[PDB]
Symmetry: D2
Subunit: 144 residues, 4 copies
Amino acid sequence: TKTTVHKFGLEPPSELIQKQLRANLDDDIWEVIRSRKIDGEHVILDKDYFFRKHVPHLTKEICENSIYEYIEGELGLSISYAQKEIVAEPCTDEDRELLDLRGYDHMVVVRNYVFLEDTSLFQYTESRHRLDKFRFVDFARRGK
Amino acid sequence: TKTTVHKFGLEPPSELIQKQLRANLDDDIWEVIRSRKIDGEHVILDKDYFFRKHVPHLTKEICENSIYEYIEGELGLSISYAQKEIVAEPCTDEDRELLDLRGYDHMVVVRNYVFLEDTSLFQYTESRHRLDKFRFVDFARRGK
Amino acid sequence: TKTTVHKFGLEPPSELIQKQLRANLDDDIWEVIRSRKIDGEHVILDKDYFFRKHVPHLTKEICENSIYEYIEGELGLSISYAQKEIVAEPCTDEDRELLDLRGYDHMVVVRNYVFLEDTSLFQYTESRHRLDKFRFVDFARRGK
Amino acid sequence: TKTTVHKFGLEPPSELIQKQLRANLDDDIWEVIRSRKIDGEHVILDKDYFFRKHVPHLTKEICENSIYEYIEGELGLSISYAQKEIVAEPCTDEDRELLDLRGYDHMVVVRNYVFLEDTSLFQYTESRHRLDKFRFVDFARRGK
Ligand code: NA
Ligand code: NA
């Protein structure tokens, strides 16, 4: 199941990432945009954004592997909680260029905001799935 | 936001509920099928199934209110964990009769299996949303 | 495993419960103090405190049974998240009057703050265990 | 807050670790035993045990830093869930040699079992705290 890095770069945030990542003008933000090919189709589009101030070093090779493992490796003990929001959205132009969308009109979009022990929003992920390629499992634990 | 009870009954399980609820032939299962009207449209279809042996008493009035609150009220201390599985599915005939599906072809389907302290699968819920009417939030808590 | 209700009453909050429950002077708060006898010893002291404004009706019989089930029954759908803090504390005078503390000097104290969908702190529980009678299990779920 | 590595080694499992880690005779297990000095006292004793087959490489320097971050870095995407069990135990001889236990007789013991996506128990941690130095926070998330 191959992973392709489409965009990857370190720049100031766009206005959307200023809102999503609570970042300023003068914050250096890593942007990584990838697609996943679950043979033989490109079906998920993964967009990560996180502050360089906390993760100063990154490479194209780390993105073709796991950004999660890399990030946990560098500062997993400072990461406190994440908040997930899963909705469905119309496909966008970016979605149709990069994924094999067949006769699909919508996506399942998982958004995830990762915060540090000190309370700051440090990372933002937007994971866009074709409908047939989305499955989310969890608990859930009940009682007192 | 009105709630309408379409089916409601106490019978032995169909073959699908035998699989979903790990129930036998000679188990009495409550089935409740409801739709939610988030004005002014019917947009969610909620199917609950649970054993009468654990919840012997039920009414149409409890279903028009909250089955969750009722169930927690009777045996919330025995409920241990739930497991959730969220996928997307094509709409079915039952979906089109009961919900206002406009020009919609798919649904977000949340399935939830609730287990007791003694380890048994006791309840099964299948909650079917029109795509624009689905939003799921959670944590997620990270670190050691 | 018998449950004994020692105090139970509806009054304005003490200064400690003002802090613990974020309640004012003119808020009516239910206080329930119970001990659990895990035969044949009294070993846990359970203190619950919650606003009457949200749970207007209560009885001694509900406390000898389950306050959790009762509360979930009345407003479980409005309850959003709880936050738990588990520490160890020296035993207090109240602990020695009401529990069989043998040659025990400390307690395991579980504190739990329950919040509503609207964001307000609605309930506070303080559960004090003798050391040998404390066991807490959980997950914990890992990965992306 | 300094970290001291007392034992560290790669051997077959003792009979206790065979039970705790579900390991055989012919499984190579890393054992790391550390104490934490929260100035100016040694107050926590951390025992980690995990299979070399999954983490082939390790050093004394990684243990003086974070084993969690290291492990997440190597295989965080394969880690599925953990299960935690927190109880209180009498102090042992190992506890009194390595920690400053003053006039303390008991410990808060946090045990944690980490499993992989494939279902196998892969790691076991036993974290022993002096009573005054234990605080555990969590959620807890409620409702349907
Ligand atoms: Na569609
Ligand atoms: Na003691």
